[PDB]
């Protein structure tokens, strides 16, 4: 039993490189013949605030990128081709990775979580786990030179990017994009002012996070009394908390654990004005990015 | 900026771990050079471990009791050649050199101290996280039936040090393990009986380097100028069921970058255990004790 912040194992560090362009360097992510990285990588310092990517584009050729692997079995890799795609360069390399995994792309959507690989010079320092938040953000920990560290999920043993990472917008406050190359949020990968929308207890989470709870012997909050979900949502609107959607994996906790799912409504509702000197989990605030899939797996070793 | 639990990346120790089984039990073991450690309750019957005779089960196992399989990275089964019990673990010995062994120490960790987890099942790596040895000798992680022999460790530079062996369950929540010594932190049995366990501690010195995480984040409403001297709190600590404050070179690197004194923070521990009066640090409202000074420099500075 037991509930932790668990990421991935990190697959993922044996596609890790390093680009530099001129005079900045960051991380990339090597799978098969492409080396994605952000575009940023060709962007002087004194001019962040008003980049012209079309331009720095136009005036680079593939000389322009240097690409190491250091980690491994070391590599020198040759540029063979580049090409702008959003806020992503996707690079050509004249060696695919031999040890790309099985994988995907995906964008996740507010609520869900991921594990990200902190890069720094191309070198794997740490991982943990964000989840997207509404306002499209993450609260992690990344420092200059983290750009190009990326984000994943795993289905089996194939690995879904879905993250690659751009910037600090405030404090402990981070976003970048897909590999589509779409920034999540829509923010601009550029020193300038933008301000996010503010953010919400994801609802589902917390809900998910209370079974956990109740799974672990930890029942206090739970009463007899139940909000329905309809109801839940419009207080949700009044006091920054999402929109609740039901889905089968918090089916199975209420199943599991014979609490009802508007029980736990009704309990955050009360739990948000406070808990009165009492703890659930070791928190004496709500925790909302602890997902139903987490918590299933975690708990009760199940995944669908 | 930004403060969050990290662990390792876990590649290094992913390729060191395999499936251990000992009759129809089954667990994970780690792989270094010639050498697998396991648990050594994959010995018993699941019956049998409310009270089992480890000195009987193990003169009753051959070298081919144990079989052990690696399944991730080049797959292969390994056979045992050798077998000993040392405390709680067996050590076998297998006919192939792992080679994709790092260099590596084992010590034992203390208190106060975080290391790395990868949570294993049937030899195949699912999860890491970062956990504290707590003043009671326990550790508080997530961990199912299939976890035993999952592994924790620290690195320095090039080298992994391994320190903990998961063994079993002590509570909701609640785990211990084994050093690679074979010795049992918090000197638990393994075996399925109630155990007591001494009462948790706040880890005053990890504390106060979240408290330097905070300032260092733009968040320090809590310091005043009021201070209170390092034998005082430690006084005061005793009695309010936090550990000794033992000051180090990585809490002073904080609070020379700061400009507050360790002193501040102190009193500031004193006042905000007593409640943080609707207010929250680092998105909490309960203190944090599970990142140490060593954890802030290196995810704040460069350090």
């Given at each position: 039993?037991?509930?932790?912040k668990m990421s991935h194992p990190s697959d993922v560090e044996?596609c890790?490189?390093?680009?530099?362009?001129?005079?900045?360097?960051?991380?990339?992510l090597?799978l098969?013949?492409?080396?994605w990285?952000?575009?940023?990588?060709?962007?002087?310092?004194?001019?962040?605030?008003?980049?012209?990517?079309?331009?720095?584009?136009?005036?680079?050729?593939?000389?322009?990128?240097?690409?190491?692997?250091?980690?491994?079995?070391?590599?020198?890799?040759?540029?063979?081709?580049?090409?702008?795609?959003?806020?992503?360069?996707?690079?050509?390399?004249?060696?695919?990775?031999?040890?790309?995994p099985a994988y995907t792309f995906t964008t996740v959507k507010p609520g869900a979580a991921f594990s990200v690989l902190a890069?720094?010079?191309?070198?794997?320092?740490?991982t943990f786990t964000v989840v997207m938040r509404?306002?499209?953000?993450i609260?992690g920990?990344?420092?200059?030179?983290?750009?190009?560290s990326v984000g994943y999920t795993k289905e089996g043993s194939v690995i879904n990017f879905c993250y690659m990472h751009?910037?600090?917008?405030?404090?402990?406050?981070?976003?970048g994009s897909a590999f589509d190359?779409?920034?999540y949020?829509?923010?601009?990968?550029?020193?300038?002012?933008?301000?996010?929308?503010?953010?919400?207890?994801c609802?589902v989470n917390?809900?998910a996070?209370?079974?956990?709870?109740?799974?672990?012997?930890?029942?206090?909050?739970?009463?007899?009394?139940?909000?329905?979900?309809?109801?839940?949502?419009?207080?949700?609107?009044?006091?920054?908390?999402?929109?609740?959607?039901?889905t089968?994996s918090?089916?199975?906790?209420?199943?599991?654990?014979?609490?009802?799912?508007?029980?736990?409504?009704?309990?955050?509702?009360?739990?948000?004005?406070?808990?009165?000197?009492?703890?659930?989990?070791?928190?004496?605030?709500?925790?909302?990015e602890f997902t139903p899939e987490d918590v299933n797996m975690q708990?009760?070793?199940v995944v669908m």
């Open positions: 039993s037991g509930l932790v044996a890790m490189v390093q680009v530099t362009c001129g005079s900045m360097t960051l991380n990339g090597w098969d013949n492409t080396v990285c952000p575009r940023h990588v060709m962007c002087p310092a004194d001019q962040l605030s008003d980049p012209n990517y079309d331009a720095l584009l136009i005036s680079m050729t593939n000389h322009s990128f240097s690409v190491q692997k250091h980690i491994g079995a070391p590599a020198n890799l040759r540029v063979v081709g580049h090409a702008m795609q959003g806020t992503l360069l996707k690079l050509t390399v004249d060696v695919a990775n031999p040890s790309t890069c720094y010079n191309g070198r794997p320092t740490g509404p306002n499209y953000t609260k920990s990344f420092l200059c030179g983290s750009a190009g751009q910037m600090e917008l405030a404090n402990g406050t981070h976003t190359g779409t920034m949020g829509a923010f601009m990968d550029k020193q300038v002012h933008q301000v996010q929308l503010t953010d919400k207890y609802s917390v809900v996070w209370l079974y956990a709870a109740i799974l672990n012997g930890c029942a206090w909050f739970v009463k007899p009394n139940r909000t329905s979900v309809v109801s839940f949502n419009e207080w949700a609107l009044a006091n920054q908390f999402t929109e609740f959607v039901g089968q918090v089916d199975m906790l209420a199943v599991k654990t014979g609490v009802a799912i508007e029980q736990l409504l009704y309990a955050i509702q009360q739990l948000y004005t406070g808990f009165q000197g009492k703890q659930i989990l070791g928190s004496t605030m709500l925790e909302d708990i009760m070793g």
